[PDB]
Design a protein around this ligand. Sequence first.
Ligand SMILES: [Mg+2]
Ligand SMILES: [Mg+2]
Ligand SMILES: [Mg+2]
Lengths: 240, 464, 121, 57, 193, 385
Amino acid sequence: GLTMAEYFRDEQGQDVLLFIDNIFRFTQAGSEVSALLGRMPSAVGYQPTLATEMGQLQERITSTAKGSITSIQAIYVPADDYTDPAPATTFSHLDATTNLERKLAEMGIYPAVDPLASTSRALAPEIVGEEHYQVARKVQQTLQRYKELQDIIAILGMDELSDEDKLVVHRARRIQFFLSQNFHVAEQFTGQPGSYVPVKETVRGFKEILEGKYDHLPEDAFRLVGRIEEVVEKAKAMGV
Amino acid sequence: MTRGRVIQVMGPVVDVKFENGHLPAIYNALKIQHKARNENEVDIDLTLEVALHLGDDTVRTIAMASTDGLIRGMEVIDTGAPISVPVGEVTLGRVFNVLGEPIDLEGDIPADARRDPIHRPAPKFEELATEVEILETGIKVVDLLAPYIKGGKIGLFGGAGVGKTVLIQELIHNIAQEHGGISVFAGVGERTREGNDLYHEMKDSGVISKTAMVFGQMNEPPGARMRVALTGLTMAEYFRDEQGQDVLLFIDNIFRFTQAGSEVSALLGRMPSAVGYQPTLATEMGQLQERITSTAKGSITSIQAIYVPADDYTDPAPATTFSHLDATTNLERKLAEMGIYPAVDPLASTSRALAPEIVGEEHYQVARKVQQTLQRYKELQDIIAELSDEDKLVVHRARRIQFFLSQNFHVAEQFTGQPGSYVPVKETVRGFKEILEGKYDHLPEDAFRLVGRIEEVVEKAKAM
Amino acid sequence: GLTMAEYFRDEQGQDVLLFIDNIFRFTQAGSEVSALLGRMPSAVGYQPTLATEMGQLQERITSTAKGSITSIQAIYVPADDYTDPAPATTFSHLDATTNLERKLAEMGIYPAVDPLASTSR
Amino acid sequence: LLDAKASEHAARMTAMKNATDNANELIRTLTLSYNRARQAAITQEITEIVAGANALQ
Amino acid sequence: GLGPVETTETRPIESPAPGVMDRRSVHEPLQTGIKAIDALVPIGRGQRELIIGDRQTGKTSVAIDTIINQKDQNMISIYVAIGQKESTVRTVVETLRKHGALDYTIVVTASASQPAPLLFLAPYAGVAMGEYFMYKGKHVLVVYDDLSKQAAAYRELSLLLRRPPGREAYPGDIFYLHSRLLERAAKLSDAKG
Amino acid sequence: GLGPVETTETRPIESPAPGVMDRRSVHEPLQTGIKAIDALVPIGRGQRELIIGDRQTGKTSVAIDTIINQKDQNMISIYVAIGQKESTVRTVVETLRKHGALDYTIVVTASASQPAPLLFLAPYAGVAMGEYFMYKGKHVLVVYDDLSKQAAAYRELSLLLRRPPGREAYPGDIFYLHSRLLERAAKLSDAKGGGSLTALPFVETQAGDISAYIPTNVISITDGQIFLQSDLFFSGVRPAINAGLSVSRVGGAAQIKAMKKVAGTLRLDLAAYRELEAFAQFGSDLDKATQAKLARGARTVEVLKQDLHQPIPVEKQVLIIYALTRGFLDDIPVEDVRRFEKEFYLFLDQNGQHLLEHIRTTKDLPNEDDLNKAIEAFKKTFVVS
Ligand SMILES: [Mg+2]
Ligand SMILES: [Mg+2]
Ligand SMILES: [Mg+2]
């Protein structure tokens, strides 16, 4: 597939998309072969040449002066361990990453993207804007603060907190539920048609949430909706 | 002719070289018997077991005793069969080691007896029993809450100071008296002091006339402690197959069996598995435990003591041994501190035979009701140490139920005086049902202590 | 350094001090050549001959009938893991420990020796 | 006021009971994870030792 | 012990899976007979569903009930027992014979006392037996009573051949061992039968 | 350097253990002189008790006090030092000589600068010298300074000989090496003479971790263990014994009747006090049975303290523990318990000369009324500060 895309890029000056269904299987198959090739195993039994093979594959997917290749890749994490040699090695070749966690999926949040461990090189004030940057930073800050208070809530409870901490939790649950969405391809599972939201609407909605505009609605009205007007409608139909 | 010669000696591991096309089969037994020719030598009497064929007419074997004094070039005899132990009525009341030689200084078994090989395949699929039966021990709590199954496996989670060597003697006595069976005790990795104590206890209580004993000590090479359970197993298989009895087999610690196997595997130069165990852990366990079955003639029922490493129930060794067990039995200290004998935990003990399609519907319902009542009484302890309406009646019934689970044993008679009893399952079920209904709510709680059937408690109350 | 110090004890009958910047490095260096000499590894990738080397070093500093050598040795524990084979091996030769604390140095106590953590036999 | 004092002490006792129960459950789950880590460490260490020893031959 | 089996055909144990242009979407129900499964976790003909739990949660009972329920449906069932106890296999076969479920069932067995090489070929023998009916237009159902014992047998066999172990001492192709087996289950297209 | 040793016999180092039918149950006691051991973890003649703890806990002191106490008990002692410093061995021998304990003691030494085979061979030599006296009707006591240094030396030898390794690189037969040695300690039956051999192996842990390979190997061979903690040693508790993790499977059969009749209440009291010890900062607890148990536990803990050397006779231990358990110490404050027991020992030497003789001759504690009158008489003289 890489050769097929390279032809177009380097001979017709086009813009090519490249999807790879699971790039972990490539290194896994290499590991299976290297044992029978007669090589001394590395850590966790992998091959000595993991990084060299990964780099030899991943350095041909670039954008030269003629055309570009936008590559989206799905990577598997063995035994839910993000410190395995293969995910750790592949982390270094990416401009934007998206980490999915099983704990968020167990709560029904979909997609299960972790909002603090996912990064992008384009999240700069001069690239996306100034309002977007501040909104994203504030959302991340409140989510981190809520993450810090999980153990003490687990043991003691919510009755031994200051007013500011209760406010932080109150807004953090709403933000975490509003990060979910209903997809077009998931309609056959649930039933909802699916949603599409542009950037400005997302920034506006999270700005309103951070301002305490929707602090009185139930926390359940925020799950599996596209925009914030749909949040208002769902709360209205819930008897509030 | 058929003589081998020693080539290498590395502790408990030996190599022997034979002639072309005359090698012994795997698992055979080889004998070294040497008398000192000059003053620079010693006398040798050793037995070896074949493990691997290495090629170039060379065989690698493990030793059953100490290898100090071996000289390269000494003659080795090939017996032509695995270790063969004597079987029959001649083994009842005697103590043996892994090779079948008695160690109780009462003479030697005559050379014209019959001996059977240690290694054997399991009974075939077409020779097993198609139904599930129940072994009636005669102990009330075991018979009611954790029933035993003929041809099944039971795990004893006891300890020191809870009354384990009394329960074992009671099981031997009851089975022999009521069913006509025979018992075999195998001690793997046994301390010599505790083996001496157990032998004297059995001789005192008189059960030694119905049981055979095999000891593999803590001071033996890893090969010896690996093949002790097979000697008891092949001693019990004779009574199962030739006569058709229901036989009991006790294993003193099934963990030391796996530890000895792991040590042997390390000595032979094998790649270790997870947590450092032998690669063939499950195969060895299955080869041991699949010969304990109930065929169309008789049955072997095994009671095994299990030690759990690091208090981790997911460790490879307990996880491998738990997939063969059919029941469990836990002894606990505080139940002994209240004077309750035997000190079996009535809620921790489980069994897969407590299902309505095996024990009927009355037995099942009575057992569940007793368990629920005891659970409620356990819950109410914090409040107790006039709370509610039905809780007083619950406690009133539960004290009697908890006390009625104790029993007087035929082996405690020599220390107490009471004759000791044997309670059938129907009788104990009926007594517990009547206690649950409350037909005997007008008697003192101490009357329900160390008695047999439900008539004896009434007689005790009348005489008190 | 040890053979430079022993001369004064054995010939002038003096009492000598011997300071060692890091004893741990000593043992570490040994492991770095062990595998190249053709030796099977022991636990945590250390040389099989670890306690023998440390004992052959530390037994030469004693108090004989003529003089004595007393040694002050600074030890670095890797990642503050006191069960590592090298600190565990060298801790069985020590008679006393002297702990220096930044808390007492901030308040103006010189030397900054901790009085509640220093031990001696 | 006396009724209020009695109520205060009762509430404190009950809250402490709930906190202790939660701490016990957390201890249980942590012990499970600890045993998993223990087994993994033993396996990895023995594998490294044997892999190093096999290299000479 | 009922005598020789009189067959006249053979099939290789290692065989390729159906291709991308040989399958079709699943559109028929497989009725287990259990309300919780039939209403909450439905299963279709041609699917691959996993039953996972601790020991002593009773999954053999689920398998036996599902096999028994196919009396009227035109289905052929195959039961594979890997690493179990031969006594429990005996009682399971007795349970099946009572309910008249031996008119459409094949049982393949390899108990705990058998060699690791035999414990590791049993699922492949079962799937090879099932594909004979599958490639004629019929419908088959196969049960593997424990894949976690096939994995342990394969690890034991591969460690005796001195192959470098990976995580939990399992080999590098322990994923291939199971993926090559469970990819032979398919819902064939109408051109294939 | 005192000249040659003039013997006329030799014994092979590797010789078999006495059989199952060549033994007899353990009944006689081994008196150490430490109250905590003699009361809660008794040791009988023929037993194998393990002493386990970290460094800087004082196990050599326990061994040396036990060795010193055997002056008039008809025992031969053997002390084996594996992997220790020669200076410490020299000072230990000098300590033994001063107390006159060199008339029945043999010392075998293999210090840290010696070749590994010598360290691996020392314990077998010690037990071989002991067995000679054992097989003539005598009683012997063997102490192994460290059983972990021997294991490390054996591992080094095995790895240098290219033998396949195992867990933590130890050979396959590392359990065999220690079990074959510790199973040579026995109590012989009357047909073989009646001698015995007692073993006290030492194992040192790092950071109090008893899950390690050798510590679990040796725990499962012996007849019980004694645990020493590093927290109690630093605070000043000598000896730093922990009764919550120390067991003795021989039990009360290694005790005299008076100690049996006295030790159960002490055990129960210490068990009760150990649960509530950490909550002394918050008083205002149930006035019925919380501070009373705290006071009883503190009085118990003060009684079990001791000083280096100076072991105590068993009759004196029995009498003081009887005084503590019968409620004769509540009036005396905690800070005066040590001085109270010392002055009580001084008092018994003058006006309590018949209770001690009764305990020595009969092995049962004297009449309750006489004991009560004696303790009442002493208390009137002891002036409490
Ligand atoms: Mg994917
Ligand atoms: Mg199953
Ligand atoms: Mg010490």
